[PDB]
Structures are given as C-alpha cells and as structure tokens.
C-alpha cells in the first residue's frame, strides 16, 4: 500500500503511552535506574489514575499552544527508495487481500460442526491460535466463518481462540507493483523541566521496544532503527527554556499498488488447417 | 484555547494552559455551551459528560 509512518506512530504511541501512564509499577520498573527523587517526582506528577498533570502527543506546526510541561512532538522526516524488484513485481495474487487482522472468537456447535465466526470475510487464514488440525478434522473456511468437525472434538464445544487472518476485497487477479522505501520520523519529548525530558526519553524508548512486536510493524514498517540526539534547549527566550532530546525512528517499508489484470483465459482450442501450396 | 474532550478529561477535568480569570466565549461543534454545562475550579475546566 501507500503508507504514512507519521500517522502510524501517532496512532500507536498515544494508546500505549496512556496505558503505561495509568499503570504505576510499569513506570516504577522503567525508571529504576534514575535518581530516587526524579523517579518519585515523575511518578507522583504524571503517573497513575489520579495524575493531575498529563502528557500529550501530536504533530508539529499546530496553530495553538501546547502542553509544554510534557509533550511528544512527532515530525515526519526524510526517506529514499532502497531496493527494487525485477519488473517492480513486489508480489502477485489470485484474490485481492486486505489488511492482516487478529480477532478473539469462541467456538459454537452448528449441525455437528464446530464453527468460529469472524467479523469480516476471510481472504486467508494464517493461524487459529493453539490448534493444528488433522485432515480428519475436515477444516474448511467459507465466507466469514471457519468450520471444524464436531465428532471427535465435543470437549471443545465452547473453546475460546484468537484467529489471525486477512480480509479479502474482491475476487480478482493482479500484480502488486511497487518498491521498498527507508524513511525517518523524528520524535522529541518537550519539557521545561530537564528531568521530565529525560524521563520522557526513557518512556519513549520503552514504548518503541514494546512496539517492535506489534503486527503493524512486523508485517510492514520493518527494521526499526533508533538514533538519539543531544539534550538541548528547543526554545531559549521565554521566561524559561524548553528542553528536549530528539530521537529518530527509521523504518523500511513497501510502497505499492494493486495493478488488477482483467484478462483471463479459460479455454485453449486447437484447429488443423491444410496447406495445399 | 482549544481542547479535544475525552472520557478522561470529562472525569478529571481539562487542566487549562492559561490562568483563566473569566471566559468571554465558549463553543463546540453543536454550538454555544451554556453556563449550566461548564464549570471552572482550581484552573480546571469541568464539562457535562
């Protein structure tokens, strides 16, 4: 697909940041190496459900004033194409497949089959969690349902699973045409307190490490590489300075389009014609 | 000022950037916000859920 690393990072960082900040022992583990007073002051101010201060995330160049006490500024950077395929063919498909998804589901009995229901039509099934079927189990997929023989499996009549699958758009042939790009985004934790900037740096590094395992950047946005700048005053001529430490996140990812092929051939036919010269 | 309002900010109140002495105008996508539907305490803004 076409991709937007900045909007991915914003969407991914915001919930993760919230869920760490609402959970005191995570911060208590992340900041174990800092000075005791720095740790306790940060945990008192920003952390837990009762926290009176708050962190914020957003893109650069807003028209309004931000929470300069603690704010992650996201800042889309450079990139370049790095590797190309022969014919620019990144892949080919017989059935137009959408995004990868993971969904929780439960088995139910139906007509002496077990079935799992999924919210969308299954374009491909990658994994039913914790199950490997035998041929006897007569595994079949149909529409948005996975179906599974009941006879030997009655103990599992309400078994709970996670389905990893991917959507289908439509039944069509085509070529995925495109290339790989290596692209940079900068993130900086702004604070007018230097110890807050240093803690926001630690929290962001933890978040990015945790992010490396996510399906989003396992399937796309691969090879996350991190670089770190000096701590410096970002703005120097207010009533106080604003400090930050930049980090650069670099990703390798595919830019591509679905070139559908309308041509289809369903019968050869043969004829002999005679040359009398 | 402008703020996006979310469940946390409803429950906890928006901490305002400025030390507001008084409000001269307050509005949302649905129109003006009437004084029974907002309150300021301790430089926090509380809104009707």
């Amino acid at each position: 697909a076409i991709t937007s690393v900045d909007s991915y990072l914003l969407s991914e960082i915001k919930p993760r940041l919230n869920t760490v900040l609402e959970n005191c022992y995570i911060i208590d583990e992340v900041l174990k190496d800092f000075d005791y007073q720095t740790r306790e002051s940060f945990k008192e101010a920003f952390c837990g459900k009762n926290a009176q201060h708050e962190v914020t995330v957003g893109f650069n160049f807003p028209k309004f004033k931000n929470n300069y006490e603690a704010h992650y500024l996201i800042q889309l950077g450079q990139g370049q194409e790095t590797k190309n395929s022969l014919g620019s063919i990144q892949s080919s498909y017989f059935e137009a497949t959408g995004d990868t998804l993971v969904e929780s589901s439960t088995a139910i009995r139906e007509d002496d089959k077990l079935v799992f229901t999924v919210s969308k039509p299954i374009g491909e099934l990658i994994k039913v969690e914790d199950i490997e079927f035998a041929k006897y189990d007569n595994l079949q997929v149909e529409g948005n349902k996975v179906s599974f023989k009941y006879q030997t499996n009655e103990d599992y009549e309400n078994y709970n699973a996670n389905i990893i699958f991917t959507e289908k758009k439509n039944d069509s042939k085509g070529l995925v045409k495109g290339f790989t790009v290596e692209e940079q985004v900068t993130v900086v934790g702004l604070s007018f307190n230097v110890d807050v900037a240093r803690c926001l740096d630690a929290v962001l590094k933890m978040i990015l490490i945790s992010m490396r395992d996510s399906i989003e950047e396992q399937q796309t946005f691969q090879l996350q590489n991190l670089s770190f700048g000096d701590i410096a005053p970002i703005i120097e001529d207010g009533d106080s300075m604003i400090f930050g430490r930049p980090t650069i996140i670099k990703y390798t990812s595919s830019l591509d389009l679905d070139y559908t092929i309308t041509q289809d051939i369903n019968k050869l036919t043969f004829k002999e014609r005679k040359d009398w010269k | 000022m402008i703020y996006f309002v979310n469940k946390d900010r409803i429950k906890k109140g928006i901490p305002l950037y400025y030390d507001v002495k008084e409000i001269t105008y307050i509005a949302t996508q649905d129109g003006t916000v009437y004084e029974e539907d907002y309150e300021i305490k301790n430089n926090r803004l509380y809104l009707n859920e």
């Binding site: 300069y68 007018f192 703005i235 207010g238 009533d239 106080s240 604003i242 | 950037y17 400025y18 030390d19 430089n43």
Partner: peptide, 12 residues
C-alpha cells in the same frame, strides 16, 4: 518579560 512558558496562579 511576560510569563507565558510557566504560568502560576495570582497571589490571592
């Protein structure tokens, strides 16, 4: 210089 960056309550 004006107090924009860090903003504190009025004394009363």
């Amino acid at each position: 210089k004006r107090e924009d960056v860090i903003v504190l309550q009025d004394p009363y």
